[PDB]
UniProtKB/Swiss-Prot annotation, chain A:
Subunit structure: Component of the 19S proteasome regulatory particle complex. The 26S proteasome consists of a 20S core particle (CP) and two 19S regulatory subunits (RP). The regulatory particle is made of a lid composed of 9 subunits, a base containing 6 ATPases and few additional components including PSMD4. Interacts with NUB1. Interacts with SQSTM1. Interacts with UBQLN4. Interacts with UBE3A. Interacts with UBQLN1 (via ubiquitin-like domain). Interacts with DDI2.
Full protein segment contained here: 1 to 191 of 377
Function: Component of the 26S proteasome, a multiprotein complex involved in the ATP-dependent degradation of ubiquitinated proteins. This complex plays a key role in the maintenance of protein homeostasis by removing misfolded or damaged proteins, which could impair cellular functions, and by removing proteins whose functions are no longer required. Therefore, the proteasome participates in numerous cellular processes, including cell cycle progression, apoptosis, or DNA damage repair.
Organism this protein belongs to: Homo sapiens (Human)
A GO molecular-function annotation: polyubiquitin modification-dependent protein binding
Chain ranges of the VWFA domain: 5-188
Family membership: Belongs to the proteasome subunit S5A family.
BP GO annotations: proteasome-mediated ubiquitin-dependent protein catabolic process
Protein's name according to its UniProt entry: 26S proteasome non-ATPase regulatory subunit 4
Linked residues for Glycyl lysine isopeptide (Lys-Gly) (interchain with G-Cter in SUMO2): K122
UniProtKB/Swiss-Prot annotation, chain B:
PANTHER family per the UniProt record, alphabetical: 26S PROTEASOME NON-ATPASE REGULATORY SUBUNIT 13
Subunit relationships: Component of the 19S proteasome regulatory particle complex. The 26S proteasome consists of a 20S core particle (CP) and two 19S regulatory subunits (RP). The regulatory particle is made of a lid composed of 9 subunits including PSMD13, a base containing 6 ATPases and few additional components.
General function of this protein: Component of the 26S proteasome, a multiprotein complex involved in the ATP-dependent degradation of ubiquitinated proteins. This complex plays a key role in the maintenance of protein homeostasis by removing misfolded or damaged proteins, which could impair cellular functions, and by removing proteins whose functions are no longer required. Therefore, the proteasome participates in numerous cellular processes, including cell cycle progression, apoptosis, or DNA damage repair.
Protein name (Swiss-Prot/TrEMBL): 26S proteasome non-ATPase regulatory subunit 13
Family, similarity comment: Belongs to the proteasome subunit S11 family.
Gene (name only): PSMD13
Species per Swiss-Prot/TrEMBL record: Homo sapiens
GO molecular function: structural molecule activity
Swiss-Prot record, chain C:
The gene coding this protein: PSMC3
Organism lineage string: Eukaryota, Metazoa, Chordata, Craniata, Vertebrata
Protein name (record): 26S proteasome regulatory subunit 6A
Full-protein residues shown: 53 to 116 of 439
Function according to Swiss-Prot or TrEMBL: Component of the 26S proteasome, a multiprotein complex involved in the ATP-dependent degradation of ubiquitinated proteins. This complex plays a key role in the maintenance of protein homeostasis by removing misfolded or damaged proteins, which could impair cellular functions, and by removing proteins whose functions are no longer required. Therefore, the proteasome participates in numerous cellular processes, including cell cycle progression, apoptosis, or DNA damage repair.
Quaternary structure annotation from Swiss-Prot or TrEMBL: Component of the 19S proteasome regulatory particle complex. The 26S proteasome consists of a 20S core particle (CP) and two 19S regulatory subunits (RP). The regulatory particle is made of a lid composed of 9 subunits, a base containing 6 ATPases including PSMC3 and few additional components. Interacts with PAAF1.
Modifications the protein undergoes after translation, according to the UniProt entry: Sumoylated by UBE2I in response to MEKK1-mediated stimuli.
Signal peptide limits: none
Domain of life: Eukaryota
Curated annotation (Swiss-Prot), chain D:
Organism: Homo sapiens (Human)
Gene: PSMD7
Task of the protein: Component of the 26S proteasome, a multiprotein complex involved in the ATP-dependent degradation of ubiquitinated proteins. This complex plays a key role in the maintenance of protein homeostasis by removing misfolded or damaged proteins, which could impair cellular functions, and by removing proteins whose functions are no longer required. Therefore, the proteasome participates in numerous cellular processes, including cell cycle progression, apoptosis, or DNA damage repair.
Note: Does not bind a metal ion.
Chain positions of cross-link Glycyl lysine isopeptide (Lys-Gly) (interchain with G-Cter in ubiquitin): K80
Entry's family note: Belongs to the peptidase M67A family.
This protein's name: 26S proteasome non-ATPase regulatory subunit 7
Oligomeric and partner information: Component of the 19S proteasome regulatory particle complex. The 26S proteasome consists of a 20S core particle (CP) and two 19S regulatory subunits (RP). The regulatory particle is made of a lid composed of 9 subunits including PSMD7, a base containing 6 ATPases and few additional components. Within the complex, PSMD7 interacts with subunit PSMD4 through their respective MPN domain. Interacts with TRIM5.
Amino acid sequence: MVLESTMVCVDNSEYMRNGDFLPTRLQAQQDAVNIVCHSKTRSNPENNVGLITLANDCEVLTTLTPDTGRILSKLHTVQPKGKITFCTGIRVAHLALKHRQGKNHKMRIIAFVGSPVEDNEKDLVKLAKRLKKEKVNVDIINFGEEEVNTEKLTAFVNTLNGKDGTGSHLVTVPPGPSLADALISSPILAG
Amino acid sequence: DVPGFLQQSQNSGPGQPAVWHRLEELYTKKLWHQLTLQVLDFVQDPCFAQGDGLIKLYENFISEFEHRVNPLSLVEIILHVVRQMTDPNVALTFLEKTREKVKSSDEAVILCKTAIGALKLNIGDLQVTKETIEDVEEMLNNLPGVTSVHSRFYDLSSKYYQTIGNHASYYKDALRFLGCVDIKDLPVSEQQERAFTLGLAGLLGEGVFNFGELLMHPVLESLRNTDRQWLIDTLYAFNSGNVERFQTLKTAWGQQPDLAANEAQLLRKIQLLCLMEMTFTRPANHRQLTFEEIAKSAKITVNEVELLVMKALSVGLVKGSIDEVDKRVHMTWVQPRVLDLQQIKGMKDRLEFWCTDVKSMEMLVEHQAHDILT
Amino acid sequence: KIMKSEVLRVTHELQAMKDKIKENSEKIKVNKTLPYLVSNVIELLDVDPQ
Amino acid sequence: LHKNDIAINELMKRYCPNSVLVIIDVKPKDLGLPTEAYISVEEVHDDGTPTSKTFEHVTSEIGAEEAEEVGVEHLLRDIKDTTVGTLSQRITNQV
């Protein structure tokens, strides 16, 4: 089947409980993690899935393991503190990819971004140059917005996305009362 | 009430629609955090405090049933409600209503009890307010040492400093206020009185012997250059030692209120500084001394030097016991506690001398000792 | 019911305890299998001065 | 001692009880005792600085209870015991 590692980064800021969008969509994207981890489990049960947030003091909630029975429990007690942290959020997983058991598992990291990015374009091109340098599959998922959706993140992805053939895809969700599961499951990354 | 809010929201004063445009846009967008930031922007602006009585209750209810944003903003805006209304009768029901409303998610009880005690620190009650202040400092001694809540605790120690009962605690918390300052963003025009009552409070502080901790930090000596140097001069003389009595006399009679009764105790405090400086000046070369330097530096008679050294031993800063027959002054361990540069350079001299002497003895004994014994 | 949503984590911890007691409770059968001899017991209360 | 040690130690402060810290050397060229016990406790500072994690030095001793003394003594066969007298005293008094 498919031998690859899955890393998800969820936001724990207070920007995920606003009443305009879904009713505390944290549970909705939790069900998204559930359907992508159970979908990858149905495709290849040997894939390991890690859990970590993007707070100031990043904490590894669950080590990379195919056993999601305790991951379902670890998805709770999100500790809604902090706002956003991007640099050590990338470096806390992309550098931790070397701690996986199976060396044949490809590198794939996703992230749920629910807060505006605090890093300037220089950090975007330095981190995009680092991720394109080490050649890690990066899927950017941006939930919620305050300013325009993609102004510098467009060039961030275009400069970050190498290997144009069957490479990485960008997930941009527009506002809407519909669920996010079917909207993020539309690309080829899910399934 | 959302469709019913557009009427009183749109209708406002002449300049209010400037913030009511983005306020109603963020209100229709239902962004509770941006709405909260706009509320803090409206409260932070120097409003006329005339037509805000409606938005205080409206945003009070919204902040009540929103159950999303940190209710500390509600604590601040309700401090502005009780500050604008000046009604302490309903303040207990309002703050208690916030206590009943705020669930057990974040430890905000330190700021809730801080606001309650702060409002109760008026002439109505003092003792129970001091007890609940001790409860505030007693509750949370955990890792969140942001010290901002503890800086408001320093404000409560200032309202407690309004009482002449205890001056020592305001200095102990005033060291924490000395160490918790981040930048000069807060108005310097207030820092004039902050350093004024901070210097006078440090002088009147009877729970400390040396003043070098206050003057040692550069933020105070850098924030006192604008003010008149009549206090910096007497703080440098009180720190570095009072060899004369004319300057300390003119500044001892310069501050008229509350300094007459405390003047004698301040003399009993500064009479030990010449002792610690006269015993830490000469580290070696006949440390033994006589009472002539004490009586000459303190312009006191020979009959009172026994009570002077008896008080010096009663304070506990010195352990000196003199086995003399004819009057002599032998001293022991003492702490400078402020600074000594000639003792830093002399520390390097005597330290390097000790090091090269130990090295000389090691090479001397080990030289032939290693060759004959190994 | 937002305050009662933390009970799920407690139930997950308790069912995790029931999932982890099977090993240390399973060694009871192999450690307490068979007492090979018989020994008489005489009760005598002692005092140490938990 | 790097700055990140407060975050590394903070995990075992949350999940585990108060953790002691030991700084050693990668090269055994230091003549001093390689082990230094640093307790992870927060102390109040007089200058007014905010309360932070402080590493106070706790004294340490290197001893073996029953077997490691025998194993070390057999593996070395070069070190000497206490041996009060001339050599063990004069070596300390020289070096």
